[PDB]
Design a protein around this ligand. Structure first.
Ligand SMILES: O=C1NC2(CCCCC2)C(=O)N1CCOc1ccc(F)cc1
Length: 371
């Protein structure tokens, strides 16, 4: 079980694709919901994503049918197509997934944020960093549901620097485009969702607190956060969950005026990556860093909840620390940071001590020694 949000609101979920092309925005929306009596949300909703994960693992595509057999019925505790809870303007998080992931696999984070009163737009990147994604070649294909699938690109070592950088720039552009789409929907522009789902997008009119926008992401998504902030000042702060810094150009490090929070796992990080994080620091800039004790890179994604303790620990999906404990720390510390730097009038300042890593399962800053 992926855990329910800890906040006071029920949580809804839906998909939005606009436009229908491979240059369009594709996202999964998690939002405060009126009702709590809808079907839960199917976690990995098409077989092709499992074929995708199989290539990301470097196994035969038959492993995909086995992954699907194991995980293809699993849901996540968000009310599918529930109407939006009205009568309140919600701040917005745009969320970026890791390499080999896709939009649906950080529901534990997305659901928790929504339950505290955020709308979360988990984008699906079309840069070939996703295990899989899809779109429609033209209008005809969109009307009849004829999907075109795009799979993870495997790189030669000679391509790594250049292509990873092309990808993080495209990721940043997709985050800005998703923000613009949501903002245009907030300002009432009618938008025909390329997916025929029974979530009326007109509900989102005048529901976004338009100043209060943040970007959050895991791994490749943590680089995406940083690139996005340097390019798009509409985002007022960023939170990088166990960021993979390699994709970033040397030019970006001095170019992030917004507050930035690094939440790292204990076992993922290494000097080269910490050094790059520390190139983001300047005395004028607001920077914070914490490390979750006993955590691994996968503690931020939903597969940390999808298997039992023994097999999870074997596959590096779980760490020494409990998965619910770990994600509660990351989510609560994120909430306090967002409250601080978006100027929210909620109670998330109860978790301020977590930003300084003041907790027995936290390390202030980093465990990684440099030079
Ligand atoms: O984005 C990056 N990059 C690296 C790989 C390359 C070296 C650096 C680390 C990594 O593991 N991730 C996070 C991937 O996260 C997930 C989560 C769920 C999932 F189904 C698939 C993937």
């Amino acid at each position: 079980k992926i855990p329910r949000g800890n906040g006071p609101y029920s949580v809804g979920c839906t998909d939005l694709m606009f436009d229908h092309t491979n240059k369009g925005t594709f996202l999964r929306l998690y939002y405060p919901s009126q009702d709590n009596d809808r079907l839960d949300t199917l976690w990995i909703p098409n077989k092709e994503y499992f074929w995708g994960l199989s290539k990301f693992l470097g196994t035969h595509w038959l492993m995909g049918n086995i992954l699907r057999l194991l995980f293809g019925s699993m849901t996540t505790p968000a009310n599918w197509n529930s109407p939006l809870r009205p009568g309140e303007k919600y701040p917005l998080v745009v969320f970026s997934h890791g390499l080999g992931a896709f939009r649906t696999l950080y529901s534990a984070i997305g659901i928790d944020l929504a339950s505290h009163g955020f709308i979360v737009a988990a984008v699906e990147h079309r840069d070939r960093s996703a295990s899989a994604t899809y779109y429609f070649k033209d209008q005809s294909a969109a009307e009849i549901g004829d999907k075109s699938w795009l799979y993870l690109r495997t790189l030669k070592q000679e391509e790594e620097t250049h292509i990873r950088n092309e990808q993080v720039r495209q990721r940043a552009k997709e985050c800005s485009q998703a923000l613009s789409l949501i903002l245009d929907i907030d300002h009432g522009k009618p938008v025909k969702n390329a997916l025929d789902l029974k979530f009326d997008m007109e509900q989102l009119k005048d529901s976004i607190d338009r100043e209060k926008i943040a970007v959050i992401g895991h791994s490749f998504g943590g680089a995406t956060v940083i690139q996005t902030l340097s390019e798009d000042q509409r985002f007022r702060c960023g939170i990088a969950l166990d960021a993979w810094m390699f994709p970033l150009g040397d030019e970006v490090y001095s170019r992030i005026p917004q507050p930035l929070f690094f939440i790292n796992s204990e076992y993922f990080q290494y000097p080269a990556n910490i050094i790059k994080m520390k190139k983001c620091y300047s005395p004028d800039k607001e920077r914070k860093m914490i490390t979750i004790r006993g955590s691994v890179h996968q503690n931020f994604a939903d597969f940390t909840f999808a298997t039992g303790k023994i097999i999870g620990h074997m596959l590096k999906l779980k760490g020494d620390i409990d998965s619910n404990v770990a994600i509660d720390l990351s989510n609560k510390a994120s909430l306090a940071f967002l409250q601080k730097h978006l100027g929210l009038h909620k109670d998330f300042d109860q978790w301020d001590c977590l930003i300084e890593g003041d907790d027995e399962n936290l390390i202030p800053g980093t465990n990684i020694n440099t030079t």
